[PDB]
Amino acid sequence: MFKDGSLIPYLTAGDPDKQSTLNFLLALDEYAGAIELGIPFSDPIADGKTIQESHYRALKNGFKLREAFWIVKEFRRHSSTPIVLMTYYNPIYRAGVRNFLAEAKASGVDGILVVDLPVFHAKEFTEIAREEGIKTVFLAAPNTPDERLKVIDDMTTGFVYLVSLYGTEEIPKTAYDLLRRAKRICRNKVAVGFGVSKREHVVSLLKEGANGVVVGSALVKIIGEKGREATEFLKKKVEALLGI
């Protein structure tokens, strides 16, 4: 969904408020090859400490599901940059799969990633996403075996998202191994979310085959610390990470 060598910012919708999120997105659009917009959830058990807290902040401050569509719709007035909606299954499921995807598409969403999509619903979900014109983005972690990477790659229409809970301040070997294994199996492009925080992490990861590098924790950390005034600092972090 994105150009090779793309830096893909991840932001939590509604952190601290939907307007600030829109402001951060626009300030970073010029450096992004694609963007991940996360829908806050009460139990984000698949995320790291940093991103879990942003989910808590968002919800406390009163984030509402469709405020995410607002952010996308408004962003779309100024940009065509690919947008991936990252969410937990619960919200989609509780609102009606097709209803959610149909609504997401209308706002401007290009792809969707369901962190905890039950394998039982895998098939049905992908079939509906396609019918609704939404590309699928599936996640894989260091404990994902080759046979599963393949199954994941065969269902993916957007790109394969490789994650690593390890954290760092070095990218663990288990992370690099996951990347190495994926590039040897995926026909789809892969993006990596290994918690980058330094320029060398970006260079390294792209040199090892990551088509794109996501930057989420690094940005969310600054937003938890600067609230609405995170914008300027976000722009600098991304530049540092981009070697500019």
Q: Structure tokens of 134?
A: 């939404």
Q: Structure tokens of 82?
A: 């690919």
**Vertex 83: Cα angle to 197 and 94 (nearest 5):** 105
**Which among 17, 47, 67, 153 is annotated as catalytic?**
47
Backbone angles phi, psi at 240, to 5 degrees: -55, -45
Give the integer Cα–Cα distance in Å for 202 and 11.
18
Q: Which of 49, 39, 42 is nearest to 11 (CA)?
A: 39
Give the integer Cα–Cα distance in Å for 163 and 233.
25
Residue 121: beta bridge partners? none
Write down the experimental method used for this entry: X-ray
- Catalytic residue list contains 36: yes
- 122-130, long-range: CB within 8 Å, 24+ apart, which pairs? 122/155, 124/97, 125/97, 126/155, 126/157, 128/97, 128/98, 128/101, 129/101, 129/157, 130/157
Q: Where are the chain's structural domains?
A: 1-244
Q: Which of 31, 56, 10, 19 is nearest to 228 (CA)?
A: 19
The CATH number of domain 1-244 is 3.20.20.70 = yes
Question: DSSP for 120-181?
Answer: HHHHHHHHHHHHTT-EEEEEE-TT--HHHHHHHHHH-SSEEEEE-SS------HHHHHHHHH
Contact 233, 226 (CB under 8 A): yes
**Which among 36, 67, 110, 132 is annotated as catalytic?**
36
CA atoms within 13 A on the CB side of 140: 33
- Calculate the CA dihedral of residues 209, 201, 12, 111 and round it to 10 degrees: -10
Across the chain, how many H-helices and E-strands are there? 11, 8
Backbone angles phi, psi at 205, to 5 degrees: -55, -40
- Catalytic residue list contains 47: yes
Those residues with Cβ within 8 angstroms of residue 184's Cβ, 6 or more apart along the chain or in another chain: none
Given resolution (angstroms): 2.4
Using DSSP bridges, classify how beta strands 6-12 and 159-163 pair: parallel, antiparallel or unpaired.
unpaired
